[PDB]
Amino acid sequence: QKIAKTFTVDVSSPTENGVFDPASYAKYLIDHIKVEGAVGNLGNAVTVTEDGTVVTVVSTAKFSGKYLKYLTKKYLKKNQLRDWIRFVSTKTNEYRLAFY
Amino acid sequence: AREITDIKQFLELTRRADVKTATVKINKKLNKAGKPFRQTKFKVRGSSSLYTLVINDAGKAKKLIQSLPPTLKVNRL
Amino acid sequence: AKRTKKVGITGKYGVRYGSSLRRQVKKLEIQQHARYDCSFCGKKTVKRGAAGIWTCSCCKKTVAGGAYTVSTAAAATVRSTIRRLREMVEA
Amino acid sequence: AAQKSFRIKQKMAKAKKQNRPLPQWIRLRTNNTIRYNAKRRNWRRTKMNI
Amino acid sequence: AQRVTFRRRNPYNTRSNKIKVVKTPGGILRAQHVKKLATRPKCGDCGSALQGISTLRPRQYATVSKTHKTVSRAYGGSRCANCVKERIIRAFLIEEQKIVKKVVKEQTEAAK
RNA sequence: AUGGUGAACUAUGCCUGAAUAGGGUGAAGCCAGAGGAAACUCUGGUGGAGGCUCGUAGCGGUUCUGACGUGCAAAUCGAUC
RNA sequence: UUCAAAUGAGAACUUUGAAGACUGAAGUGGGGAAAGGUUCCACGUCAACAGCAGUUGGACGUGGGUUAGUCGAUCCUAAGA
RNA sequence: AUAUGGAUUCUUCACGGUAACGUAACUGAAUGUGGAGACGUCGGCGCGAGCCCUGGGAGGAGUUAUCUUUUCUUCUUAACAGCUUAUCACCCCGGAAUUGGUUUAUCCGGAGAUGGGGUCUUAUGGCUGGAAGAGGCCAGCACCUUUGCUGGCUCCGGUGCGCUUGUGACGGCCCGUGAAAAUCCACAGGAAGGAAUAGUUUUCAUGCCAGGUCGUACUGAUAACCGCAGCAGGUCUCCAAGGUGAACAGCCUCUAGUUGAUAGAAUAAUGUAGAUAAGGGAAGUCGGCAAAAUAGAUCCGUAACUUCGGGAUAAGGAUUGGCUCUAAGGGUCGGGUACGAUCAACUUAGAACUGGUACGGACAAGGGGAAUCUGACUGUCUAAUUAAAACAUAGCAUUGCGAUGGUCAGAAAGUGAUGUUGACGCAAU
Ligand SMILES: [Mg+2]
Ligand SMILES: [Mg+2]
Ligand SMILES: [Mg+2]
Ligand SMILES: [Mg+2]
Ligand SMILES: [Mg+2]
Ligand SMILES: [Mg+2]
Ligand SMILES: [Mg+2]
Ligand SMILES: [Mg+2]
Ligand SMILES: [Mg+2]
Ligand SMILES: [Mg+2]
Ligand SMILES: [Mg+2]
Ligand SMILES: [Mg+2]
Ligand SMILES: [Mg+2]
Ligand SMILES: [Mg+2]
Ligand SMILES: [Mg+2]
Ligand SMILES: [Mg+2]
Ligand SMILES: [Mg+2]
Ligand SMILES: [Mg+2]
Ligand SMILES: [Mg+2]
Ligand SMILES: [Mg+2]
Ligand SMILES: [Mg+2]
Ligand SMILES: [Mg+2]
Ligand SMILES: [Mg+2]
Ligand SMILES: [Mg+2]
Ligand SMILES: [Mg+2]
Ligand SMILES: [Mg+2]
Ligand SMILES: [Mg+2]
Ligand SMILES: [Mg+2]
Ligand SMILES: [Mg+2]
Ligand SMILES: [Mg+2]
Ligand SMILES: [Mg+2]
Ligand SMILES: [Mg+2]
Ligand SMILES: [Mg+2]
Ligand SMILES: [Mg+2]
Ligand SMILES: [Mg+2]
Ligand SMILES: [Mg+2]
Ligand SMILES: [Mg+2]
Ligand SMILES: [Mg+2]
Ligand SMILES: [Mg+2]
Ligand SMILES: [Mg+2]
Ligand SMILES: [Mg+2]
Ligand SMILES: [Mg+2]
Ligand SMILES: [Mg+2]
Ligand SMILES: [Mg+2]
Ligand SMILES: [Mg+2]
Ligand SMILES: [Mg+2]
Ligand SMILES: [Mg+2]
Ligand SMILES: [Mg+2]
Ligand SMILES: [Mg+2]
Ligand SMILES: [Mg+2]
Ligand SMILES: [Mg+2]
Ligand SMILES: [Mg+2]
Ligand SMILES: [Mg+2]
Ligand SMILES: [Mg+2]
Ligand SMILES: [Mg+2]
Ligand SMILES: [Mg+2]
Ligand SMILES: [Mg+2]
Ligand SMILES: [Mg+2]
Ligand SMILES: [Mg+2]
Ligand SMILES: [Mg+2]
Ligand SMILES: [Mg+2]
Ligand SMILES: [Mg+2]
Ligand SMILES: [Mg+2]
Ligand SMILES: [Mg+2]
Ligand SMILES: [Mg+2]
Ligand SMILES: [Mg+2]
Ligand SMILES: [Mg+2]
Ligand SMILES: [Mg+2]
Ligand SMILES: [Mg+2]
Ligand SMILES: [Mg+2]
Ligand SMILES: [Mg+2]
Ligand SMILES: [Mg+2]
Ligand SMILES: [Mg+2]
Ligand SMILES: [Mg+2]
Ligand SMILES: [Mg+2]
Ligand SMILES: [Mg+2]
Ligand SMILES: [Zn+2]
C-alpha cells in the first residue's frame, strides 16, 4: 500500500572531468523537486544524498523516473551542460550521466 | 497448436514414432505478485499438431528432460 | 392529450391528396393495421401481413381473409349460405 | 486489364517483341533498303484494340 | 490514424466481402475477410432454431462429428422435441380412435 | 432502291450488385393525470409516421441572358440555383 | 514560392539539405473494378517529344521483373442465350 | 489410401439425464422427408471490434531568459486449437385478482405467468496453447568491410447519448411482403451385414500420399482509361486521426503525399475576378438584371385562410464574449427474518465580476408581406438556345373481352406478348 522507491544516478563520468559538480546538482533537486504542488515540501516523504560518485533519491510520494530525467535535464540546461551530458537509463530505475 | 498437461500423455507423445523433433523453451515470468521464477515449455512436434507442455515447476522441469528419449532431436532453447 | 382532431393515422400524408381520399384510406388503414381475435386460441393476436393474409402472434394459425379486414361481409354471408346449403344434404 | 485471359496476355506478349529498333546489322546487307523500323508502336500513341 | 485496404481483388462491398479490422503482432492494423455468418438449422414442424444442434455453414457440417448434428431423441436433429411430443400423442390417439371407429361401425352393420 | 453494321452514347424493361453528413417537424400506437350527473371532454408524457422539410455528398441545370466564344472544352468554367 | 550545395559543357526547372506553404482523411493519403499493356524496376541517355528549359520523364537505348491445394477464374444458377 | 490406439458386442448395433439435452466414438441400403445455401427497408434500444479520449509506470525524443512532476512518442499479439463465454429459445417444480411480470418503444400468462432451479446456439468475449523465440522501444560495446555482439524494457489501469462498422432482440411500412441453382447436413425408414474363442465398427484420436490449368507487374487518373493530346470535361468502389461546431459542413492541424501549372521587369488605357463609397433610395431598367439586405441558437410573440394535416422560422421582437461561483440531474457494494462508503460523467437553469456595449465576433447562415394568372401536390422532358402553364400522377369516367376470347407480334409455322394471367382481371381511350 505504502512503498518507497529508489532512484540512482551515476554522475561519475562527467564529474571526473570537473565540469560536473554534484554539490549544486543534488542541491538543485532538494529545493526544486515539487511535492503535491510545490518545492520545499519534502516532509520526510522524499530525500536526496550524494555518494560522491552517485546521487541518490528516495521517495514515498508521487515520483517517477521520467520526472527525474526532467528536473536534471533542466539543471544540465541551466549550467549550459546540454550537448555535453545525456541523462540515460542503464538498467531499469538506475540512471547515469553520459559524457563524451 | 495444442496444449498438453498430463505429464504421462506427454511422454507417450514424445515416443510416437512420427515425432522426430522437440524443442525446450525457458521463460522468466513472475510468481503470483512478487518475485520471479523459471518457466519451461516442452514442445513436441507432430505430423499435424505441435504439442506444448508447460511445467511451471523448475524441478519437474529438470527431471523431465532426462526422461526425454535419447533418439529425439531436442532443440534446446 | 388529443394529438390530432380528425386525421388520426392519416396525419402522415399531411395536406396532400385532398380530405376525402384521406378519409377513405384512413378507414381501411385503421382496419388493416388493427389487432384481431383468433378464431382458434381466442387471443386478440391477429395482425395482417400483406393483403388477405392474417396470422396469429402466438398459436401461429394463418387465415386467408379480406384485403384490409379479417372477415369481409361477402365472405361471411357465403359462410352462412354454404352452412344452409350443406344442411340440405344431411336432413 | 489486370485479370487477363491467357489469350490477351499472349497478344500482349507478342507485341512486346515487335517493339524493338531495327537490328542494326540488316542495314549492312547487300541491297538493303530498310532504313528504320517502320511499324513501331508506342503504348500512349496507338492503342492496339485487344 | 491508421487506415486499411481490402485483401482481395473485389473492391466493392458485397455480402461476400465483409471486412474485420485486426491488430497483428507486428503492431499494425490489417484487414481480414469475414465469412458470412452461419444461421441455425430450423424445425421441420414448427420452425424454431432447433437446439442441441451446432450452427455452421452447410458444407462445414461434413467436417464435424455426428453428435453436433443431433439430439438423442426420435427425430433428433430434425424436429423440435415439443413438436415430437405432439406427433407422438396424435399418433396414439388417432390409432386408438380408429379402433373405436371400427367396432362402432362393426356394430352398425349387425343392428340396423 | 438493295444488302448489310450498330443499344461502349442514350431511351425503356428485366437479373444481379452497390450508394445517401448533420438538422427541423412530431402522425398511429402507448403510459400517467384533470374535469364532468352523465354523455363525454381535457392535460403532461411516450413513441417516431411522411412520394414531409433545412441542407451536404449525390443527381439536376435556374439566372447572371456572368466567363469562354480561333475555348481548358465540338457544351466547358464560376457564382447563384 | 525561397537559400545553399552537389552534379553537369550548360541548372529558374535535376539530386540533396534548409526554409516557406498545400492537399487536410468527402485527401494531392493507402488500395482496387473496367480500360490500357510494360507504362513497373535498374542502368545508360537527350536527336525528336514533355507548346519556356532540361543534366529530368509515363521519352529514347538496353536489360530485369509477375512464384498459390487455401486469392480470383474454374463449379452454380439469374434476366437471358 | 490406410493401419494403431480407442469405442462397442455374450442383453449384439453406447450410455447417462424426470426433461429440455449430454458425449470422443457409438453400423444403416433403396425410398421418403426436413434443414442449410436463402435473401426488403427504415427506426430506436442492446452488445462486440477498430478508432477516439485518458491515469500510473518503464524508456527515447523536444522546450526550458522565465513557467510547465511538461510537450511529443514506444508499451503489439494472426489464422488456428483447448476450456470458458449469450440475448433469444426450451425444460422441471409450481398454480396466479389486490392481477402480476415487464420494454426507451404495451406486450405476455390457466394453451400455466411472477418465482426457484436447469438445457441449448457459441455471434462475441476472457484465459491458455500458437507466442516471444516474433514485432516494437532503448542502452552498452565493436570496425573499411559482410556487418555483427551483448544487455535490458515490451507493464497495470480508467472513461461513453463518442466515431466508423458489425451484430442482436424488437418495432414501422406495403393493392411492393423484397432471387435461383450447385452444394452440405440431418431425420423417417430397416434392406442387409455383423460376436465369445472372438466379431463389427473409420461421422472418436493419431498416422500416409497428392492437389493440375490460367491470371498475379504498374496506372486507375488536373499525365498510364475515354474525350485527335501529359485536354480545367467524363469515368463503378473500400479504409478514413485532432480541435471548433449539430456534423463526414466550412476553417486550422498529425500521418502520408505534394510543392507540379514558362519565367523576369513594370503596374497605362480597356478588361476578367474580388471589394468599399457621402446624401438620396429604384428616380435606373422591358423588368430591382446585378448587387445589397437577412441568416445560428435560446426565449417571447405570431394574421388571413384551410381539405384542420397546415399556413409558420408567418410576421414581430429580445438575447449571445470572457471570467468567477451556485443549484438540480447518475453507478457500485454489505444491512436481522433511517442512512452510510466510494467512483465516474457534459447537460441545463440561476448569479456575480469584467470590457472603447463588444460577443452565431473568422467560418457558417432563410429577406419578408399583400394580391392576380396558371398547374393540385412529389415527380418528367427538348444531351448541346425552350424546365414551363407542357408530360406524368393519384382521382373521375368511358370502351373491349368468359379463353373456340379481347389487344397486339410474325413471311410462315406443331410460331409468339398479355399469361406463373381470368373481370377486385388483361387490354384500349
Ligand atoms: Mg497512438
Ligand atoms: Mg489485391
Ligand atoms: Mg447434440
Ligand atoms: Mg453441441
Ligand atoms: Mg432408430
Ligand atoms: Mg448499356
Ligand atoms: Mg444493402
Ligand atoms: Mg441522415
Ligand atoms: Mg370525477
Ligand atoms: Mg426523425
Ligand atoms: Mg422531399
Ligand atoms: Mg426539401
Ligand atoms: Mg435548421
Ligand atoms: Mg446546414
Ligand atoms: Mg454537382
Ligand atoms: Mg433529379
Ligand atoms: Mg452553370
Ligand atoms: Mg452568357
Ligand atoms: Mg475574346
Ligand atoms: Mg444547393
Ligand atoms: Mg519552377
Ligand atoms: Mg491547410
Ligand atoms: Mg471536408
Ligand atoms: Mg496531381
Ligand atoms: Mg495504359
Ligand atoms: Mg519509372
Ligand atoms: Mg536537347
Ligand atoms: Mg511526351
Ligand atoms: Mg518543349
Ligand atoms: Mg530541347
Ligand atoms: Mg524503355
Ligand atoms: Mg524494356
Ligand atoms: Mg477460394
Ligand atoms: Mg479448374
Ligand atoms: Mg462411451
Ligand atoms: Mg433434400
Ligand atoms: Mg429451404
Ligand atoms: Mg442471394
Ligand atoms: Mg481463417
Ligand atoms: Mg432462470
Ligand atoms: Mg432440474
Ligand atoms: Mg442513451
Ligand atoms: Mg458505409
Ligand atoms: Mg417480414
Ligand atoms: Mg443441418
Ligand atoms: Mg436384400
Ligand atoms: Mg475420420
Ligand atoms: Mg498487385
Ligand atoms: Mg496499384
Ligand atoms: Mg498519375
Ligand atoms: Mg488515351
Ligand atoms: Mg484514337
Ligand atoms: Mg483531364
Ligand atoms: Mg500520388
Ligand atoms: Mg498552362
Ligand atoms: Mg508575368
Ligand atoms: Mg451610397
Ligand atoms: Mg429606406
Ligand atoms: Mg417606393
Ligand atoms: Mg420606372
Ligand atoms: Mg415599363
Ligand atoms: Mg415585365
Ligand atoms: Mg437576383
Ligand atoms: Mg453594407
Ligand atoms: Mg405568409
Ligand atoms: Mg454574460
Ligand atoms: Mg453535483
Ligand atoms: Mg429571479
Ligand atoms: Mg407542378
Ligand atoms: Mg416539382
Ligand atoms: Mg435544351
Ligand atoms: Mg435537336
Ligand atoms: Mg423545373
Ligand atoms: Mg435550360
Ligand atoms: Mg376533380
Ligand atoms: Mg404446322
Ligand atoms: Zn391463435
**Neighbouring chains to D with at least 3 Cβ pairs closer than 8 Å:** none
Residue in this structure with the C-alpha cell 396525419, named with its chain if needed? C11
The C1' atom of H210 and the CA atom of B47 lie apart, in whole Å, by: 16
How far apart CA B61 and CA B65 sit, in angstroms, is 7
The C1' atom of H281 and the CA atom of B45 lie apart, in whole Å, by: 97
Encode D10-50 in three state secondary structure. Answer: HHHHHHHHCCCCCCCCHHHCCCCCCCCCCCCCCCCCCCCCC
Mapped onto helix, strand or coil, the DSSP state of residue B37 is: strand
Helix or strand run (H / E) with residue B59:
helix B58-67
Mapped onto helix, strand or coil, the DSSP state of residue B75 is: strand
**Contact, C2 CB vs strand F, < 7 Å:** yes
- Cell numbers representing residue A7 in the block: 532512484
**Strand pairing of C53-56 and B50-55?**
unpaired
The residues, any chain, with a CB within 8 Å of residue D16's CB and separated by 6 or more, are none
How far apart CA A91 and CA A70 sit, in angstroms, is 18
Q: Which residue places its CA closest to the C1' of nucleotide H226?
A: D47
How far apart CA E6 and CA E19 sit, in angstroms, is 8
Residue C83 one-letter amino acid: R
Q: Which residues pair with C62 in a beta bridge?
A: C55
DSSP secondary structure string for all residues of A45-68:
SEEEEE-SS-EEEEESSS--HHHH
Q: Which residue places its CA closest to the C1' of nucleotide H14?
A: E72
* Cβ atoms within 10 Å of A77's Cβ, excluding its own: 10
How far apart CA E75 and CA E85 sit, in angstroms, is 11
How far apart CA A92 and CA A66 sit, in angstroms, is 12
Mapped onto helix, strand or coil, the DSSP state of residue E96 is: helix
Radius of gyration of chain E (CA): 27
**Contact assessment for residue A94 and residue A8, using Cβ atoms and an 8 Å cutoff:** yes
The C1' atom of H394 and the CA atom of C17 lie apart, in whole Å, by: 7
Mapped onto helix, strand or coil, the DSSP state of residue B77 is: coil
CA A29 vs CA A68, C53, E61: distances in Å: 9, 86, 71
Pick the ligand that lies closest to the CA of residue E5: 2
**How much distance in Å is there from the Cα of A73 to the middle of ligand 76?**
106
**Strand pairing of A86-91 and A55-59?**
unpaired
Question: According to the entry, how was the structure determined?
Answer: X-ray
Residue in this structure with the C-alpha cell 382458434, named with its chain if needed? C40
Encode chain C in three state secondary structure. Answer: CCCCCCCHHHHHHCCCCCHHHHHHHHHHHHHHHCCECCCCCCCCCEEECCCCEEEECCCCCEEECCCCCCCCHHHHHHHHHHHHHHHCCCC
**How much distance in Å is there from the Cα of E33 to the middle of ligand 2?**
12
How far apart CA E49 and CA E80 sit, in angstroms, is 9
